[PDB]
Structure formats: structure tokens, C-alpha cells
Amino acid sequence: VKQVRVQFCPFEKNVESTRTFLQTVSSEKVRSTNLNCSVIADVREPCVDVLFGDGHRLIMRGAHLTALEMLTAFASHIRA
């Protein structure tokens, strides 16, 4: 709920799971509400790091994940 950082490599093999997760979290409707939370995308196998203020590191590999599965897991962790 504090910070989220995502690494994806269109230079390397392309996986759309993290890529699609970007526009899900880059929406105003989510960004305005989560003003405390900060989102940064990096372009160089994909990596998702969520740094909770509760001392939890949500580490996710978005290669063999479903588009919405990514969101469901994130939702389960943040809502708790």
C-alpha cells in the first residue's frame, strides 16, 4: 500500500501479464485513491515488487500469471 515497482523487458521476451497490469494501476480511479502509494515502471522474466508499510514484500513473477490473476493476488494482499 506504500510502494509498487514493476520490471518488464520488451527488449527481451515479451509477456503481457505485467504489461497489462500497468494500465490497471495507471488508472486515475486507482491512483487518486492510493495517493500514498507510488508506482514506477521500468523498461529493460518480469518482476513485481510491492513494498508494504506493514513490513511485507510482495514479490511476484508475472511470466506464468494470468492478467486478472495478477490483480486478484494483489487485491487479497492489500485488502487483507
Binding site: 520488451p10 527488449f11 503481457e16 491512483r31 515502471a41
Partner: protein
């Protein structure tokens, strides 16, 4: 997809998956593009091509610092003749070195 299959640009097919837009101009104001990109952190750049040369963001950032073309063309000749200039300077400095040391001795006195 169909165009990118058979065109000058073919390697951008993996890049063009999902929603995408293109920045197009007639001038290579790459600095301005990257400058306005830094404003919004979340927004990524996937790369593309500048001046008919295909490259990604990591290449585009270092490219953003570039002077005028004609002077770089002249600097090419300058760098080519740099070795000759170095040889000439190494040959010519030692008489100049003796003259400058004599001048420094004058200044000391």
C-alpha cells in the same frame, strides 16, 4: 500487424502488443520527448526508431545529448588526424619546451 510483417521495420512486432501510441515529428527533438516523459513516472517508453535507426529507451536517453551534424562531421576528420597531430605536437613541443623554460627562467630572475 500486417504492415509490420513486411516493411522496413519488422522487429517492432513484439513491441506492438496491446495498446500503444506513437510520437511522430519531422525534427529529432528526443530531449523534449524524454523531458516530458520524466514528468509522469508511471508512463513507460518502449523505444522505436529515430532517424531510421531502431533502438530502445536505454539508447534514446544517451542519444538525447547531441550537437549539430556538420561539426561532428568535421570532428570525424579531426579524430582521424588526431594521431598525426599528436605526432607533430610531440615533435614540436621540445623546442617550444626549451623556449618556455628559458622564458620561465627570465620570469624567475
Amino acid at each position: 500487424k500486417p504492415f509490420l510483417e513486411d516493411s522496413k521495420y519488422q522487429n517492432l512486432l513484439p513491441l506492438f502488443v496491446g495498446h500503444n501510441m506513437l510520437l511522430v515529428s519531422e525534427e529529432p527533438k528526443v530531449k523534449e520527448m524524454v523531458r516530458i516523459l520524466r514528468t509522469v513516472p508511471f508512463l513507460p517508453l518502449l523505444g522505436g526508431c529515430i532517424d531510421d535507426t531502431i533502438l530502445s529507451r536505454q539508447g534514446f536517453i544517451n542519444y538525447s545529448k547531441l550537437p549539430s551534424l556538420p561539426l561532428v562531421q568535421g570532428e570525424l576528420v579531426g579524430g582521424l588526424t588526431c594521431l598525426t597531430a599528436q605526432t607533430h605536437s610531440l615533435l614540436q613541443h621540445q623546442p617550444l619546451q626549451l623556449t618556455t623554460l628559458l622564458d620561465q627562467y627570465i620570469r624567475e630572475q
